[PDB]
Amino acid sequence: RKKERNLHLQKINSIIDFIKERQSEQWSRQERCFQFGRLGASLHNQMEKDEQKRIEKTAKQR
Amino acid sequence: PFRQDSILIIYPRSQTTLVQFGLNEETFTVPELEIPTQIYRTTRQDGSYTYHSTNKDNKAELIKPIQNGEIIDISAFTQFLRLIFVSILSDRANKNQDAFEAELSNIPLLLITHHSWSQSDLEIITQYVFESLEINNLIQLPASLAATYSMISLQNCCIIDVGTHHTDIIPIVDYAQLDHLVSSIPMGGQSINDSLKKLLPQWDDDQIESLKKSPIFEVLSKNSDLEFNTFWDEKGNEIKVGKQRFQGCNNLIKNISNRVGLTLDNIDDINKAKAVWENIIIVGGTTSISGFKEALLGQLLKDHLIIEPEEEKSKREEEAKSFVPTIEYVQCPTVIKLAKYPDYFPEWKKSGYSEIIFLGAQIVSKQIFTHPKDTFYITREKYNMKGPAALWDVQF
Amino acid sequence: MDPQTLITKANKKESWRYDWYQPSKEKYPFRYKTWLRNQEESCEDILDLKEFDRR
Amino acid sequence: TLNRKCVVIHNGSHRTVAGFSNVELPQCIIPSSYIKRTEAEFIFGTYNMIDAAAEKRNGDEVYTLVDSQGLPYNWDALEMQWRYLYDTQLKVSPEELPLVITMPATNGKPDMAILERYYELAFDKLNVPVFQIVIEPLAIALSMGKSSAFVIDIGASGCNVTPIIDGIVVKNAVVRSKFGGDFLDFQVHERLAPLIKEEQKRSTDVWYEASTWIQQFKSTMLQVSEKDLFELERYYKEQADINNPLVQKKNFLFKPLNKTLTLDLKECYQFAEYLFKPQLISDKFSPEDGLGPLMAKSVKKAGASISPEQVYSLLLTNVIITGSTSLIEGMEQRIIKELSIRFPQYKLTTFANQVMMDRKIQGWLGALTMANLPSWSLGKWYSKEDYETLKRD
Numbered sequence: 025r026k027k028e029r030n031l032h033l034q035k036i037n038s039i040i041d042f043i044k045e046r047q048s049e050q051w052s053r054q055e056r057c058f059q060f061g062r063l064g065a066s067l068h069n070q071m072e073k074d075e076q077k078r079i080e081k082t083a084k085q086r
Numbered sequence: 087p088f089r090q091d092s093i094l095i096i097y098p099r100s101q102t103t104l105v106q107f108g109l110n111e112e113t114f115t116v117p118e119l120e121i122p123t124q125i126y127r128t129t130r131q132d133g134s135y136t137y138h139s140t141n142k143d144n145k146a147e148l149i150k151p152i153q154n155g156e157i158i159d160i161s162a163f164t165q166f167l168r169l170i171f172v173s174i175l176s177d178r179a180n181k182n183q184d185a186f187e188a189e190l191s192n193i194p195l196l197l198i199t200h201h202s203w204s205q206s207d208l209e210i211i212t213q214y215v216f217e218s219l220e221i222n223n224l225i226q227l228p229a230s231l232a233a234t235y236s237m238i239s240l241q242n243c244c245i246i247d248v249g250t251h252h253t254d255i256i257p258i259v260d261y262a263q264l265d266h267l268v269s270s271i272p273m274g275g276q277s278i279n280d281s282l283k284k285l286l287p288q289w290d291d292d293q294i295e296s297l298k299k300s301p302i303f304e305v306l307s308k309n310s311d312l313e314f315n316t317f318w319d320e321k322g323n324e325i326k327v328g329k330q331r332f333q334g335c336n337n338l339i340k341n342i343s344n345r346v347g348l349t350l351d352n353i354d355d356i357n358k359a360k361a362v363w364e365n366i367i368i369v370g371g372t373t374s375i376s377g378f379k380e381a382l383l384g385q386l387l388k389d390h391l392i393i394e395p396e397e398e399k400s401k402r403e404e405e406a407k408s409f410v411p412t413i414e415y416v417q418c419p420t421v422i423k424l425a426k427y428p429d430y431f432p433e434w435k436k437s438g439y440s441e442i443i444f445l446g447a448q449i450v451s452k453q454i455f456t457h458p459k460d461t462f463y464i465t466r467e468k469y470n471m472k473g474p475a476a477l478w479d480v481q482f
Numbered sequence: 483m484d485p486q487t488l489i490t491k492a493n494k495k496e497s498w499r500y501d502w503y504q505p506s507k508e509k510y511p512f513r514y515k516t517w518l519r520n521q522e523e524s525c526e527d528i529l530d531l532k533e534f535d536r537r
Numbered sequence: 538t539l540n541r542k543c544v545v546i547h548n549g550s551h552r553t554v555a556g557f558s559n560v561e562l563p564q565c566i567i568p569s570s571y572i573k574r575t576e577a578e579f580i581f582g583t584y585n586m587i588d589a590a591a592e593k594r595n596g597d598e599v600y601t602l603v604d605s606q607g608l609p610y611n612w613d614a615l616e617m618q619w620r621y622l623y624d625t626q627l628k629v630s631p632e633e634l635p636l637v638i639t640m641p642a643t644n645g646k647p648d649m650a651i652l653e654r655y656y657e658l659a660f661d662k663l664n665v666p667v668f669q670i671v672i673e674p675l676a677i678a679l680s681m682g683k684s685s686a687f688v689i690d691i692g693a694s695g696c697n698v699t700p701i702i703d704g705i706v707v708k709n710a711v712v713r714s715k716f717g718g719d720f721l722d723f724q725v726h727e728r729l730a731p732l733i734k735e736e737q738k739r740s741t742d743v744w745y746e747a748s749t750w751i752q753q754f755k756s757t758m759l760q761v762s763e764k765d766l767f768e769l770e771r772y773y774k775e776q777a778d779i780n781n782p783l784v785q786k787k788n789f790l791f792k793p794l795n796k797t798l799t800l801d802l803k804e805c806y807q808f809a810e811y812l813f814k815p816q817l818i819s820d821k822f823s824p825e826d827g828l829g830p831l832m833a834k835s836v837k838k839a840g841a842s843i844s845p846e847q848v849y850s851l852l853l854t855n856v857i858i859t860g861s862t863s864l865i866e867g868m869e870q871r872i873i874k875e876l877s878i879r880f881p882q883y884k885l886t887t888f889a890n891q892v893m894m895d896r897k898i899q900g901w902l903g904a905l906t907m908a909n910l911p912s913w914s915l916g917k918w919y920s921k922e923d924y925e926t927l928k929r930d
């Protein structure tokens with residue numbers, strides 16, 4: 025009896041342990057696309073600046 | 087890494103496919119290759135099959151791997167793809183004796199994925215990329231994802247994809263694609279043609295088709311200032327037409343809005359839903375027709391805008407006339423708006439943005455392939471580690 | 483121009499197969515299909531580009 | 538860790554959620570009901586059913602797939618539903634991939650009956666390579682990192698309360714209140730009917746309305762009173778003699794008729810109160826049937842099933858507020874208040890996932906989670922041998 029409960033207790037312990045592991049390990053789909061969003065925004069900062077400088081270059085060319 | 091000229095972006099579609107091997111380095115340009123999505127199949131003794139670019143001896147069958155955006159014969163599809171890849175290999179090899187000393191060396195592959203493909207479909211495709219075409223750099227982007235970059239990156243937005251026999255409805259929240267809400271309508275540009283044929287049953291189908299393509303065809307809300315106008319046929323004939331040139335679009339549009347409403351009504355976080363409604367993106371060849379996008383917006387607007395119902399608003403005003411604070415509602419949308427285009431791509435500005443989804447892919451492509459990490463794509467290593475399953479490690 | 487050899491020249495590796503697999507601790511009385519590291523016609527011609535170019 | 542992936546199917550009482558273990562979000566979610574057409578034709582799919590509703594064809598009928606116990610009802614139709622998913626949403630033969638399904642906690646009485654039927658479906662009809670079934674509230678607690686938890690399922694088709702002690706579903710303490718989402722939907726419909734134009738094919742239309750504007754209403758118009766509305770009202774009147782937000786109006790457009798509906802705050806609160814004071818619904822209900830006392834009952838019964846003092850401190854510090862209905866603003870706090878009333882001597886610790894999406898599909902996510910563990914053998918995986926054994930004499 026006692027050990028049967030202990031078995032169950034450790035079984036669910038290991039279940040939780042695998043779950044909490046994956047909570048930090050997984051890095052879910054949403055995490056990727058969210059970071060891409062951020063990434064993209066900074067790219068668009070460059071888009072704006074670089075295009076402006078490309079225009080500027082042309083203006084300086086003549 | 088990576089050579090601009092070696093980055094291959096392929097965009098499949100129910101009709102043709104866009105291929106653009108190599109980037110323009112300085113700027114972005116419109117894909118120059120366009121190949122009909124068809125391949126021939128020869129039935130040999132006991133059903134053995136071959137594939138052909140043409141109809142060998144008039145015995146091969148016409149196969150169309152993609153139907154309504156969905157792969158219906160993956161064997162044929164990968165054969166089609168194979169043909170394309172080797173076509174451009176031989177093209178450049180003939181054009182450049184030293185092609186394998188440079189541009190045909192390390193070739194990045196970006197394939198645009200239509201959402202309807204199954205999990206198993208995708209696996210098989212990646213299998214052929216690495217085990218048939220032996221390509222050591224694979225990205226299979228969600229088509230909708232690509233679109234969200236093109237519109238100066240949006241967090242909450244909608245993608246309306248107008249096809250020829252189908253239209254896809256996609257909602258993006260927090261940059262993620264809500265797959266359980268994503269759907270599709272069995273209607274597209276062809277339905278316009280169908281209704282135009284119904285409208286003018288005495289016309290040749292080609293007259294109708296070429297008219298659809300023609301600048302005289304328009305969705306309304308200076309050829310609009312004339313009762314009649316003309317258009318030159320494929321055969322050089324002068325086609326004269328009345329206001330029928332502004333007809334045949336509402337059926338499509340109405341059905342689009344039906345699903346748009348139903349789909350967006352299922353977004354859980356209403357705060358985000360409100361944001362989604364202010365960023366609507368419209369893509370597809372048919373959407374190039376002038377006024378189309380505006381009409382679609384308008385239809386969506388009049389059928390979903392939360393605003394004190396006409397007369398009731400006037401009753402507030404009526405009683406005032408004898409200032410009324412804004413009659414706020416707990417519902418949404420209160421603002422319906424189309425997303426803003428980037429003004430930093432002259433080439434695309436000039437071409438129009440009906441194919442802008444490719445641009446979005448191009449933009450993110452240089453973002454990915456000039457980056458020091460390989461975080462978002464399958465390498466030969468990763469492929470060796472997981473097999474086809476590697477795709478869900480990098481899944482977007 | 484043999485397209486297959488062009489492939490062998492381009493981009494210059496364990497293959498997998500989709501097949502049945504039995505779970506084990508030991509082996510369990512059931513099987514399922516998956517991508518297994520495996521045991522270890524074509525289009526026949528080449529498409530004439532220039533016909534498929536936007537010009 | 539392991540070379541596998543799987544199909545997860547959650548036959549909820551209202552939504553059927555299904556998808557692949559590979560992804561964070563479900564492949565699709567469809568109504569746990571279908572349209573029968575006549576020869577025999579079965580319609581599944583959110584939009585498909587909506588389109589069927591738009592058709593309004595005589596003879597179309599709505600049938601649910603899940604009964605009041607949270608168990609499969611029309612087993613032949615169940616076959617058709619899963620078949621539908623395998624062909625159109627998952628798009629894979631049921632024979633290739635593994636299948637994990639779930640069910641709500643019960644008192645154990647129907648366990649064997651249900652498994653027999655599932656073995657018939659899974660093996661005799663679909664040839665599913667391997668089969669497993671798990672308990673939903675258990676899975677939820679586990680996904681929360683809890684070994685012990687008081688699961689409060691504020692969902693549709695009743696309110697489930699499941700005391701979990703040391704990874705044990707206390708079946709004797711598990712209760713299933715008849716009140717929940719569906720009930721409120723009924724009340725909303727009935728209360729708003731006075732402002733709507735006129736005040737079985739009809740029932741197919743009821744489903745339509747339930748799936749559309751009713752759901753929209755409840756998503757934002759309902760709100761849960763912080764305190765007991767009755768006492769709170771009195772309180773404000775006292776304070777008035779000594780501001781009272783109950784007179785504040787809220788607006789909602791009745792889309793299909795294009796008209797503004799206006800309710801005061803108190804009325805919104807009145808709907809919420811039905812889950813706490815069902816005796817205000819009618820003379821067929823007892824004060825003990827409110828969530829407050831139901832919870833207390835299940836807590837106490839849990840204590841009875843095993844050191845009450847410790848049991849109470851355990852359950853009351855591992856409270857999980859979940860279920861779709863729990864998203865009604867203020868619900869969480871009200872639960873806390875009810876708990877402090879009936880257990881003023883215990884410190885309360887509750888949990889609630891702030892992301893709306895996560896709660897809506899949390900049961901599925903729980904199943905998803907369990908389906909993703911590396912120690913394969915932990916589950917009670919079933920095969921044809923179990924079907925055989927069952928049928929062996």
Ligand SMILES: Nc1ncnc2c1ncn2[C@@H]1O[C@H](COP(=O)(O)OP(=O)(O)OP(=O)(O)O)[C@@H](O)[C@H]1O
Nearest residue numbers: 549550551552692693718755756860861862864865
């Ligand atoms: N925004 C919302 N806020 C609160 N409740 C909602 C909201 N939208 C829908 N609901 C209710 O949630 C119900 C579905 O929730 P849920 O899936 O938790 O119930 P269920 O899972 O079918 O019940 P069970 O958990 O017994 O299967 C719908 O019937 C609807 O009435």
